[PDB]
Design a protein around this ligand. Structure first.
Ligand SMILES: [Mg+2]
Ligand code: NA
Length: 266
């Protein structure tokens, strides 16, 4: 049923919709185009923060190190970093801005601190993700050209990598919890998966937004008294407007809730 419902939602969107879910309480998993590539856009920033935290755990980076930068480093969509040219920001403040506001300059400064897109990709390979690839910087990585494998993931690989990072022992307990806390504090996803999930659930998420009608959201969801559910949703080549694309994502969450046994709103 869920596959046919998502096929109909995909038709409404006019684009290509990818979904992956895994429930760590029951083990139930689901995919719709789960092995097809989609542009990550800003969903990669969750993985970037994880790679930075791994360097902190190794003593190669410090969350309190202050990065100064200039006006010339600002790229489009930098709501936090544009306020701190004068004083700089610490590595922790840049991770917070990249995840919770999707700040693009913060992501570029963190990519520079990591060594670049190949460093992030090599980190992902080292933790068992053989799919996801980062090739470019902000804002070019949001081009989302159909057929272009640069800066892509698959819904199943991204949800699997989130499980490794948030439940596995890749990161120290402090770093793992910090990453979770940043995702829980996200400010950009209120109209996406969060809008379709039960109000009692605790949610961390990272959105992505790009050209070619690309709207994405990846989330870790804790229902009360319940091991977490991981959800990755990618929508691209969509023909409907930005609010309608957000509503597609929220509807995926509602459809997952409806298909899940014993789960409901209210
Ligand atoms: Mg359950
Ligand atoms: Na400066």
């Amino acid at each position: 049923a869920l596959s046919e419902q998502l096929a109909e939602l995909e038709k409404r969107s006019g684009g290509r919709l990818g979904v992956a879910v895994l429930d760590t309480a029951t083990g139930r998993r689901f995919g719709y185009r789960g092995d097809e590539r989609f542009p990550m856009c800003s969903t990669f920033k969750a993985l970037l923060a994880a790679a930075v935290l791994a360097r902190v755990d190794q003593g190669k980076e410090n969350l309190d190190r202050r990065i100064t930068y200039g006006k010339e480093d600002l790229v489009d969509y930098s709501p936090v970093t544009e306020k701190h040219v004068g004083d700089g920001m610490t590595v922790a403040e840049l991770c917070e801005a990249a995840i919770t506001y999707s700040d693009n300059t913060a992501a570029n400064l963190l990519l520079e601190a990591l060594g670049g897109p190949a460093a992030l990709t090599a980190f992902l390979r080292s933790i068992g993700d053989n799919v996801t690839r980062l090739d470019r910087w902000e804002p070019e990585l949001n081009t989302a050209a159909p057929g272009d494998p640069r800066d892509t993931t698959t819904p199943a690989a991204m949800a699997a990598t989130l499980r490794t990072l948030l439940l596995g022992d890749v990161l120290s307990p402090a770093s793992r919890q910090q990453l979770v806390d940043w995702l829980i504090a996200n400010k950009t996803g209120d109209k996406r998966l969060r809008a379709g999930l039960p109000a009692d659930d605790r949610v961390g998420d990272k959105t992505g937004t790009g050209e070619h009608g690309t709207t994405n959201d990846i989330a870790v969801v804790w229902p009360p008294n319940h091991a977490p559910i991981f959800i990755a949703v990618y929508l691209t080549e969509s023909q409907v407007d930005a609010d309608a694309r957000d509503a597609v994502i929220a509807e995926v969450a509602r459809l997952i809730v409806a298909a899940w046994h014993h789960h409901h709103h209210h």
